[PDB]
Amino acid sequence: ERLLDELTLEGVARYMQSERCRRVICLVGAGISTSAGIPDFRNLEKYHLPYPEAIFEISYFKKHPEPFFALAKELYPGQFKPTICHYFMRLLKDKGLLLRCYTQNIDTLERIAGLEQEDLVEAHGTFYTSHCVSASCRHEYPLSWMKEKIFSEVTPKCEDCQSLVKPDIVFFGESLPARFFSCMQSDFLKVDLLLVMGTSLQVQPFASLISKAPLSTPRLLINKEKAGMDFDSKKAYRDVAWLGECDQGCLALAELLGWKKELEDLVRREHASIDAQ
């Protein structure tokens, strides 16, 4: 099927406004959180890492966790404040359009923006909660405990069994949560639109999600750069790229949908609430 009239942001907006477009899946990455003061993870010289990527690999981390926690100290934001892009997804939720948000991010900003547990697949886990790595113990630790360890530069260690404590993030080389595969098996059978934001789709198996949708499902990319997507060839029929920052892409789309005022009000009242804490 051909569902978009034209392969443009205006085309996608018209499609979203039509009765046909009922359920939208968002697929999001690091680019949706850069304007919230969280840099794209993709001083440390003193650790003499075998290569830079070892810092996020589970095998390296379990034996040498210090570089990761050193980086965590530098990356840790002074505040957790979701972006315009996060609040665009909140609008999708409130308008009954959000089937699911699959996130690569560990920053909890989707939760803070008001997406509920059931709205979310936190594909790479979360920094919010932490656990001892020992299967026979699994002692839980809260963010305040983890933050204290990070800022004091004391490696997190279990108070019961002395094992390493890690944030509940999926390190490279670890399995994704069962929820990722369970939701994937259902959500991509019947979805009207994929909204792919702030990701270059370089991390597997998350990147494979775009191919799981029906062949007729239109797909909009909002990202600083291009990404099995076809925007430009003579065979292009359903994929649209909008190139720039995620906040500005979501503002442009919101304006076309007639949501610009609603989105700006939402961002401002929610930011005010967070700043008042």
Partner: peptide, 7 residues
């Protein structure tokens, strides 16, 4: 299942 990988 497929582990988290850079590609």
């Amino acid at each position: 299942t497929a582990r988290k990988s850079t590609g």
